[PDB]
């Protein structure tokens, strides 16, 4: 056996070669195919575990694939070289090859028969007639002899009470194997349309199956091999009579009563009820899997045939209702181990196959009232009483599962169960059975929910429980159903008028969170299709959600479920949005302190703060809405620094790439609006928005082509950047100061990350800042912007005693704008002798000396898969060196990035090296 694997591996490692070569694929490819098929024939009963069959079948369909690529063009005449089993001829085009496969189709080796059939059925259309097996087979049959195909179908095998007890003599297996061989010969030819159903029926096969039906019912360690080789044949007998009966029934009267008598319709009964006596034992897996499809196919082929009464008169004596009435005892949980159990299991299995075959009322018709398999109603009643005292098992649970499913496979019976389910005392039944009742109740949707929801305000606990059960069991196979879930959700959406004393007032504080979790279930159970544009009962569910945000309720820690629902609620408009803003202010100003911390950091109250703001960040983290953004931004910049500052920045950069480039500039415009309006403000609050609210967005990758906020805001504040500092009053001058500082910050961050060849260029970058397509160059706004930021911090601060600490910030932000535009321009040559350096002190000018403080001495201290999925199903069920002081200046780091850029741009350098030495080589400048 280990000798052929060498040659087969060798061909699997040379077959990709020598197909690219002549003078060798022209003489012995037929000999190669027949010799590999013949070695397959020698390796018939060796083993499947050795893997040789896989190797040689891979070899032969790897060589047929390369004979079909060329012999379509070259089925021509030449002096070939002979195979084993041929006479010496001079031309071997394809004719005696396909006739060889025709003659040796009835080789009684099983792995060769399938390969010969599936070779010939694709080797047909290469005869130059290019015909089909219907007409070609009769075309050559008519001039050779019609009784030659039965000789082919019998091969050389056209032909005791000692063998009543089965024995395994070395030719008895050959007779049974010849029976199976001749049986599986004509199976493919009857399933296909090669010859007529009576062109071969006209049988010796009928005499053989008559002998075997007379001899079916029948060395103890080799007889089981004879059992297996016996029981591999009767299933193909059943397959053959299915493919004969479900074809054209011209032979359904030619099939005489020598085989369709009580023998076949008795062994089918024995296949159904307890087939562990005919040889189909326990332990096999492949044939025990391939049994009840063809065993049901035999019944579903026979109901189109006039032997349906034969089936009734051979079945109603065996699988009568008297059997399933008499098998039920009283004490089912005790020493009565298997004497009822295995027989009832086999019977319930057989009736399940019967119901799959579609003969339940055809076999055991129903009774008095209507639509009631009364056997099934009594099975339900006995299953319900079977636990009423009270023991348990596992195989008895499998008994009860199959038994209840057989009781419920009849039809419209579930309303009896809904009537049963209400009085432990009853809920114990749904406790002990939870996977069967839910998948039964899923089946008759759109009417079970009404019978359920009628019983609502009387047994609210059990109906809420069974709703949660069917909801979560629908979520389990949400990856399989995916339409039953949304239909169940939209049907329970259409019955909200029955549960009005649930989301209401003066109910005890359990039902509110119960229906809240039910809302979370029914809304996360689908995607975002059942919420929008007048889908269902949207206003009633909305106003119940609004009334659930009450004040007698639980305060905060289950409102997190409500705020995680808020991604669904937020696509509507004002009114409802105004109600939303009112109730969100009503919660924020009643549950969040004004100070920075305002709590001990060890109490649960600080963890409650982190809890609620984490939930609010969870809400905003997946619905980029301009309402929640301002809702956190107004509670953020109340004190100067709260606890979770890094969380807000990480979430802002998380929002900054989330898609929908339209709405990003919308969020930009919303927070710019809450910056920009006339209002009573603090200059800290007016500064912190443009400081650390939208710069986190703009600095992060918002969109590299969002030039809308670039073009459409510049001539809205370039006038106030050119306007007059009206020095009259504190609470009007400081506002203009902060506004100019904010426009400086925005211009800084836009000319930070923006190239020169798309703003400097002669395009629509200019046509929006200036009125239409004007005459222009590279610096039109970036000359007057340079002019106004250099108007800043070059007029001396002699008569300047109004607000100095903020004017330092003003000069700092204006020089930040100056350095951002001087790097964003095309850095052409020594324009730094004209701008950015060399102030003229004859008019008392200054550059560094205005923004450096010079009235503070710094310290300088002494040295400074799939199971996370199966867990998430349960989760659905319940839920730079450093900065010290001088680096801490928010001007020095862009300055050193600037001079580093001027390094990596190309005596002493004029404006920034020699002039800066001249500012430092003498103590004409002070210490700071």
């Amino acid at each position: 056996a280990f000798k052929r694997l060498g040659a087969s591996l060798a061909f699997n490692n040379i077959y990709r070669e020598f197909r690219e070569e002549e003078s060798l694929v022209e003489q012995f490819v037929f000999e190669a195919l027949v010799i590999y098929m013949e070695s397959l024939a020698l390796a018939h009963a060796d083993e499947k575990s050795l893997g040789t069959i896989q190797q040689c079948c891979d070899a032969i369909d790897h060589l047929c694939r390369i004979i079909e690529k060329k012999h379509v063009s070259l089925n021509k005449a030449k002096k070939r070289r002979l195979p084993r089993g041929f006479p010496p001829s001079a031309s071997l085009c394809l004719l005696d090859l396909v006739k060889w496969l025709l003659a040796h189709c009835g080789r009684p080796q099983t792995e060769c028969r399938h390969k010969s059939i599936e070779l010939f059925y694709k080797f047909v259309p290469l005869l130059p007639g290019n015909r089909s097996p219907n007409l070609w087979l009769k075309d050559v049959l008519k001039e050779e002899g019609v009784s030659f195909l039965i000789n082919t179908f019998e091969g050389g095998g056209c032909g005791l009470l000692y063998l009543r007890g089965p024995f395994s003599l070395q030719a008895t297996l050959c007779w049974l194997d010849l029976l199976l061989a001749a049986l599986e010969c004509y199976n493919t030819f009857i399933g296909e349309r090669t010859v007529g159903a009576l062109q071969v029926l006209g049988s010796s096969l009928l005499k053989a199956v008559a002998f075997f039906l007379e001899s079916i019912a029948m060395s103890p360690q080799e007889g089981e091999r004879y059992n297996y080789s016996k029981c591999t044949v009767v299933v193909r007998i059943m397959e053959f009579t299915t493919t004969l009966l479900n074809t054209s029934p011209e032979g359904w009267k030619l099939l005489k009563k020598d085989l369709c008598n009580t023998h076949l319709m008795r062994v089918l009964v024995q296949t159904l009820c307890e087939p562990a006596s005919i040889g189909f034992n326990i332990g096999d897996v492949q044939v025990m899997a391939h049994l009840p499809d063809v065993c049901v196919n035999l019944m579903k082929a026979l109901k189109m045939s006039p032997y349906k009464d034969i089936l009734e008169t051979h079945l109603r004596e065996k699988i009568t209702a008297q059997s399933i009435e008499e098998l039920c005892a009283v004490n089912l949980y005790g020493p009565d181990a298997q004497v009822d159990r295995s027989r009832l299991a086999a019977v319930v299995s057989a009736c399940k196959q019967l119901h799959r075959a579609g003969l339940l009322h055809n076999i055991l018709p129903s009774q008095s009232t209507d639509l009631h398999h009364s056997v099934g109603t009594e099975l339900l009643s006995l299953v319900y009483k079977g636990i009423a005292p009270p023991s348990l098992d596992l195989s008895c649970k499998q008994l009860a599962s199959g038994l209840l499913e057989l009781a419920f496979a009849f039809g419209g019976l579930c309303e009896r169960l809904v009537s049963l389910l209400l009085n432990s005392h009853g809920e114990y039944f749904y406790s002990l059975f939870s996977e069967t009742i839910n998948t039964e109740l899923l089946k008759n949707l759109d009417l079970a929910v009404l019978e359920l929801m009628q019983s609502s305000v009387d047994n609210t606990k059990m109906v809420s429980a069974v709703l949660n059960g069917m909801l979560d069991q629908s979520f389990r196979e949400r990856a399989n159903q995916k339409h039953q879930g949304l239909k169940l959700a939209t049907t329970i959406l259409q019955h909200w008028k029955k549960c009005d004393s649930w989301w209401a007032k003066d109910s005890p504080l359990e039902t509110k969170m119960a229906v809240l979790a039910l809302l979370a279930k029914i809304l996360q159970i689908d995607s975002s299709v059942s919420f929008n544009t007048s889908h269902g009962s949207f206003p009633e569910v909305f106003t119940t959600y609004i009334s659930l945000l009450a004040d007698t309720k639980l305060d905060l820690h289950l409102k997190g479920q409500a705020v995680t629902l808020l991604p669904f609620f937020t696509s509507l408009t004002g009114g409802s949005l105004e109600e939303l803003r009112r109730v969100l202010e009503q919660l924020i100003v009643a549950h969040f302190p004004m100070q920075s911390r305002e709590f001990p950091p060890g109490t649960p109250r600080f963890n409650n703060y982190v809890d609620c703001m984490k939930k609010f960040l969870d809400a905003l983290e997946l619905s980029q809405s301009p309402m929640l953004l301002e809702l956190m931004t107004e509670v953020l910049c109340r004190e100067q620094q709260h606890v979770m500052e890094e969380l807000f920045q990480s979430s802002f950069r998380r929002i900054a790439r989330r898609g929908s480039c339209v709405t990003q500039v919308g969020l930009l415009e919303s927070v710019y609006e809450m910056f920009r309006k006339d209002d009573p403000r603090l200059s800290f609050t007016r500064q912190s928005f443009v400081d650390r609210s939208l710069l986190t967005l703009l600095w992060h990758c918002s969109l590299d082509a969002l030039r809308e906020f670039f073009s459409t805001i510049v001539v809205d504040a370039i006038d106030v950047l050119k306007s007059r500092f009206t020095k009259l009053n504190e609470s009007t001058f400081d506002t203009q100061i902060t506004k100019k500082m904010g426009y400086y910050k925005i211009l800084d961050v836009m000319y930070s990350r923006l190239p020169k060849d798309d703003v400097h260029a002669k395009e629509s970058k200019i046509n929006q800042v200036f009125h239409g397509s004007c005459i222009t160059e590279g610096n039109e706004l970036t000359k007057t912007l340079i002019k106004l930021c250099y108007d800043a911090f070059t007029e001396n601060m002699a008569g300047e005693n109004q607000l100095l600490e903020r004017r330092r910030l003003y000069h700092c932000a204006a020089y930040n704008c100056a350095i951002s535009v001087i790097c964003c321009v095309f850095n052409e040559l020594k324009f730094y002798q004209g701008f950015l350096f060399s102030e003229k002190p004859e008019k008392n000018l200054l550059i560094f000396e205005n923004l450096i403080d010079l009235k503070r001495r710094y310290n300088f201290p002494v040295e400074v898969s799939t199971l996370s999925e199966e867990m998430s199903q349960f989760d659905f069920s319940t839920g730079e060196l450093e900065m010290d002081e001088l680096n801490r200046h928010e001007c020095m780091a862009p300055l050193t990035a600037l001079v580093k850029h001027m390094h990596r741009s190309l005596r002493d350098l004029p404006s920034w090296m020699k002039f800066l030495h001249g500012k430092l080589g003498n103590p004409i400048v002070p210490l700071n």
Side-chain angles (χ1 to χ4, degrees), residues 1-30 32-47 49-61 63-70 72-75 77-85 87-96 98-101 103-110 112-130 132-137 139-143 145-159 162 165-166 168-169 171-185 187-213 215-217 219-221 223-249 251 253-255 257-307 309-372 374-409 411-424 426 428-434 436-442 444-450 452-496 498-502 504 506-511 513-539 541-558 560-580 582-594 596-597 599-620 622-638 640-707 709-742 744-764 766-776 778-794 796-804 806-825 827-829 831-841 844-906 908-913 915-928:
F2 279 169
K3 258 62 168 174
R4 277 99 61 188
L5 266 174
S8 163
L9 164 70
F11 199 80
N12 299 307
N13 267 322
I14 70 185
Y15 88 108
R16 188 187 137 81
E17 289 297 316
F18 85 90
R19 63 168 188 90
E20 312 176 339
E21 192 49 52
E22 329 293 310
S23 277
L24 86 166
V25 287
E26 304 90 328
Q27 306 96 297
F28 55 88
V29 183
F30 311 99
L33 175 50
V34 67
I35 207 168
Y36 270 91
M37 280 173 31
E38 198 70 28
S39 47
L40 163 73
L42 314 182
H44 165 265
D46 286 345
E47 255 300 320
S49 319
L50 263 56
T52 78
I53 41 175
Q54 277 74 245
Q55 216 55 56
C56 58
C57 72
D58 202 5
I60 57 190
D61 66 356
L63 63 92
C64 183
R65 197 160 271 109
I66 60 181
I67 198 178
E68 69 185 19
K69 197 252 162 181
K70 189 62 67 69
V72 54
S73 65
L74 276 181
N75 49 354
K78 199 36 195 163
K79 191 192 56 190
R80 281 89 151 86
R81 303 208 208 178
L82 54 90
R84 301 310 177 107
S89 72
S91 178
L92 287 94
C93 301
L94 217 62
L95 265 75
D96 216 9
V98 291
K99 191 46 172 306
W100 204 100
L101 271 168
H104 297 256
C105 168
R107 191 182 303 117
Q109 315 315 110
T110 73
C112 269
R113 205 159 52 242
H114 291 172
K115 175 57 62 175
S116 45
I117 287 177
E118 297 147 57
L119 264 177
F120 151 76
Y121 266 79
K122 88 185 305 162
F123 257 121
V124 268
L126 272 200
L127 187 134
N130 319 131
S132 163
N134 40 55
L135 67 97
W136 192 90
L137 187 50
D139 158 70
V140 197
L141 175 146
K142 57 96 179 178
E143 52 89 20
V146 197
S147 295
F148 151 76
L149 264 74
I150 179 58
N151 192 12
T152 297
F153 283 179
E154 277 323 289
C158 46
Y162 297 94
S168 157
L169 286 174
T172 57
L173 278 306
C174 311
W175 189 26
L176 298 197
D177 165 71
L178 274 169
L179 159 74
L180 183 52
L183 158 72
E184 283 198 48
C185 289
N187 199 342
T188 296
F189 306 112
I190 284 189
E192 218 276 334
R193 301 307 180 96
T194 64
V195 282
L198 313 175
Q199 276 208 359
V200 200
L201 269 182
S203 88
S204 43
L205 173 54
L206 281 197
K207 295 212 154 300
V209 305
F211 198 91
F212 187 42
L213 258 65
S215 67
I216 174 64
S219 44
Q221 313 305 317
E224 311 93 295
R225 161 172 181 157
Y226 203 67
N227 181 28
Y228 151 76
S229 199
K230 181 259 291 179
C231 290
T232 181
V233 191
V234 55
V235 290
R236 277 93 166 92
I237 294 280
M238 295 167 169
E239 177 196 42
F240 196 62
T241 175
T242 51
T243 194
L244 185 54
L245 191 49
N246 266 349
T247 322
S248 61
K253 315 298 161 286
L254 198 139
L255 192 143
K257 317 292 147 289
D258 50 355
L259 71 155
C260 55
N261 213 318
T262 189
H263 324 91
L264 184 63
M265 317 321 179
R266 198 202 218 175
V267 293
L268 195 58
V269 159
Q270 291 306 111
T271 311
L272 284 206
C273 48
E274 193 181 3
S277 45
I278 76 170
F280 275 153
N281 64 285
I282 319 291
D284 261 356
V285 297
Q286 196 170 10
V287 284
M288 279 211 55
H290 216 299
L291 172 134
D293 43 315
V294 297
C295 195
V296 158
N297 200 286
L298 188 55
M299 283 186 180
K300 262 171 169 156
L302 268 159
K303 274 217 292 195
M304 314 301 118
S305 159
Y307 305 103
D309 45 357
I310 286 293
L311 261 177
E312 300 189 32
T313 45
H314 293 72
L315 271 166
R316 292 174 196 274
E317 294 85 345
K318 339 281 190 302
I319 326 290
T320 175
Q322 302 316 298
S323 57
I324 43 180
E325 281 178 20
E326 74 196 2
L327 277 169
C328 296
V330 172
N331 190 24
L332 268 298
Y333 297 135
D336 312 337
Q338 312 300 327
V339 285
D340 45 344
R341 258 67 174 256
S342 88
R343 303 181 169 107
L344 267 179
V347 160
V348 164
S349 89
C351 308
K352 267 296 293 297
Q353 279 109 35
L354 207 68
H355 206 313
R356 194 196 292 107
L359 295 92
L360 210 75
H361 306 263
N362 289 114
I363 290 305
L364 302 188
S366 278
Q367 271 199 10
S368 58
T369 168
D370 203 72
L371 71 151
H372 275 67
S374 278
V375 290
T377 68
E378 291 297 323
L379 283 185
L380 161 76
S381 158
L382 71 89
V383 158
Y384 183 75
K385 291 161 201 59
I387 323 167
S391 294
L392 77 160
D393 206 337
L394 163 76
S395 198
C396 299
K397 303 294 170 291
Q398 198 54 253
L399 175 143
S401 85
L403 190 65
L404 191 145
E405 195 257 316
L406 194 59
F408 280 8
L413 194 147
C414 323
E415 325 302 322
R416 169 67 199 110
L417 169 137
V418 179
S419 80
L420 161 72
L421 268 185
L422 291 90
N423 190 14
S424 303
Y428 187 39
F429 177 54
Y430 187 50
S431 81
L432 294 198
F433 292 94
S434 299
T436 173
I437 317 183
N438 290 280
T439 190
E440 178 86 10
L441 263 289
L442 177 49
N444 47 330
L445 206 45
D446 308 82
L447 76 158
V449 296
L450 177 58
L452 203 57
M453 279 295 294
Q454 181 45 245
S455 44
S456 285
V457 301
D458 48 357
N459 262 12
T460 175
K461 40 184 59 51
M462 197 53 203
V463 64
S464 46
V466 65
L467 283 169
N468 295 142
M470 63 185 64
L471 263 38
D472 275 22
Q473 210 268 351
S474 61
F475 187 84
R476 177 183 92 179
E477 42 263 26
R478 100 189 165 278
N480 305 326
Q481 294 322 108
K482 88 163 93 168
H483 324 100
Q484 280 77 11
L486 56 91
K487 286 316 177 181
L488 166 65
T490 194
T491 44
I492 194 57
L493 273 170
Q494 289 157 71
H495 272 71
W496 272 91
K498 269 70 53 186
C499 41
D500 307 349
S501 171
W502 281 6
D506 296 332
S507 158
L509 202 44
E510 294 87 6
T511 68
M513 32 198 59
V515 306
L516 164 74
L518 195 146
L519 259 297
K521 271 173 174 138
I522 67 183
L523 190 53
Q524 206 162 314
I525 202 159
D526 62 325
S527 164
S528 88
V529 289
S530 64
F531 79 107
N532 56 297
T533 70
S534 299
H535 186 99
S537 164
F538 168 68
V541 303
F542 161 74
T543 191
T544 49
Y545 163 68
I546 290 302
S547 48
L548 257 292
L549 300 194
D551 316 318
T552 175
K553 59 159 202 285
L554 186 142
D555 38 4
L556 190 135
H557 34 278
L558 285 86
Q561 292 154 314
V563 69
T564 45
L565 293 158
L566 279 177
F568 299 107
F569 296 132
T570 300
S571 179
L572 42 82
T573 182
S576 44
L577 270 185
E578 203 63 76
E579 179 49 62
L580 202 53
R582 198 201 284 104
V583 68
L584 281 166
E585 288 147 352
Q586 270 278 353
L587 267 297
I588 280 182
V589 313
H591 283 273
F592 274 125
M594 195 53 66
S596 275
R597 263 69 78 186
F599 286 106
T603 188
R605 276 80 182 174
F606 166 68
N607 304 348
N608 284 352
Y609 182 97
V610 175
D611 177 36
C612 200
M613 290 312 283
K614 185 56 180 176
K615 292 285 102 178
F616 272 31
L617 197 144
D618 289 327
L620 180 46
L622 63 97
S623 316
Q624 48 186 359
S625 67
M627 175 195 191
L628 288 190
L629 187 42
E630 300 155 342
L631 192 75
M632 326 296 169
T633 309
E634 266 290 333
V635 73
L636 171 81
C637 297
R638 302 193 289 154
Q640 54 265 0
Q641 178 145 345
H642 275 219
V643 193
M644 269 168 294
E645 307 312 289
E646 208 64 81
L647 259 187
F648 284 88
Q649 303 322 291
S650 50
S651 46
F652 275 16
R653 295 176 293 268
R654 180 177 277 103
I655 292 172
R657 68 287 183 278
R658 223 188 65 85
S660 163
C661 46
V662 178
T663 196
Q664 314 173 357
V665 69
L667 308 160
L668 294 178
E669 278 153 336
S670 62
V671 192
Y672 157 72
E673 164 59 50
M674 80 160 304
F675 149 74
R676 192 262 305 161
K677 86 168 308 175
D678 171 76
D679 42 6
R681 276 290 150 85
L682 274 73
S683 315
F684 279 98
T685 316
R686 262 300 289 270
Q687 191 172 326
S688 168
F689 294 149
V690 68
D691 186 283
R692 43 157 167 183
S693 276
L694 80 162
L695 305 198
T696 319
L697 294 150
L698 296 168
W699 256 109
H700 209 68
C701 172
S702 318
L703 180 75
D704 217 352
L706 198 146
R707 274 78 56 89
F709 212 84
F710 148 75
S711 281
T712 59
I713 211 56
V714 283
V715 283
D716 192 25
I718 204 54
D719 201 348
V720 75
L721 272 196
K722 217 191 293 177
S723 301
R724 181 181 178 272
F725 285 78
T726 70
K727 326 206 307 169
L728 80 164
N729 181 84
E730 309 278 325
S731 304
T732 46
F733 186 61
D734 68 342
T735 53
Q736 221 176 340
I737 286 158
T738 317
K739 188 193 189 198
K740 286 148 185 168
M741 198 176 310
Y744 285 155
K745 283 185 180 174
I746 296 300
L747 283 157
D748 190 8
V749 293
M750 50 78 70
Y751 271 152
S752 65
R753 34 187 277 157
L754 199 56
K756 47 195 57 176
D757 51 351
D758 45 4
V759 188
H760 180 91
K762 291 181 151 299
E763 307 304 319
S764 177
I766 321 175
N767 305 341
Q768 189 42 247
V769 53
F770 296 103
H771 310 86
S773 314
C774 296
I775 182 55
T776 178
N779 49 2
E780 309 295 309
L781 190 75
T782 76
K783 277 186 76 74
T784 173
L785 166 67
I786 285 180
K787 189 258 169 186
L788 54 93
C789 62
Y790 207 68
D791 161 71
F793 57 81
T794 52
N796 49 319
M797 272 192 69
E800 272 83 346
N801 202 63
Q802 54 274 14
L803 266 193
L804 319 173
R806 334 286 311 264
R807 269 192 56 134
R808 172 185 60 178
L809 271 49
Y810 162 75
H811 306 122
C812 185
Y815 197 33
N816 290 311
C817 182
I819 62 175
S820 183
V821 301
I822 208 53
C823 55
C824 205
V825 292
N827 53 41
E828 49 275 49
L829 209 62
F831 269 90
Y832 319 118
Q833 300 175 330
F835 284 99
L836 195 73
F837 295 99
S838 51
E839 47 90 8
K840 183 167 184 51
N844 197 21
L845 265 48
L846 77 172
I847 295 182
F848 315 98
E849 330 179 330
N850 198 0
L851 76 156
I852 305 304
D853 190 272
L854 280 82
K855 326 289 144 182
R856 194 183 72 242
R857 307 296 95 79
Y858 325 117
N859 189 69
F860 304 86
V862 280
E863 286 86 15
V864 182
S865 163
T866 319
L867 302 171
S868 285
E869 203 180 345
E870 292 154 57
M871 218 286 280
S872 304
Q873 201 274 345
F874 178 74
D875 183 273
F876 187 78
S877 65
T878 191
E880 304 100 342
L881 186 144
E882 74 173 6
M883 55 195 288
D884 41 357
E885 202 272 345
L886 290 177
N887 306 323
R888 292 185 66 171
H889 206 282
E890 68 270 357
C891 79
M892 192 224 70
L895 270 166
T896 177
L898 171 137
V899 292
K900 272 169 194 170
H901 179 275
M902 291 165 174
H903 179 91
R904 58 187 57 100
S905 61
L906 263 73
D908 289 343
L909 274 300
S911 278
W912 62 306
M913 182 180 210
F915 169 61
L916 264 301
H917 156 252
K919 209 175 289 290
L920 205 62
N922 182 277
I924 207 60
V925 304
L927 76 162
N928 275 108

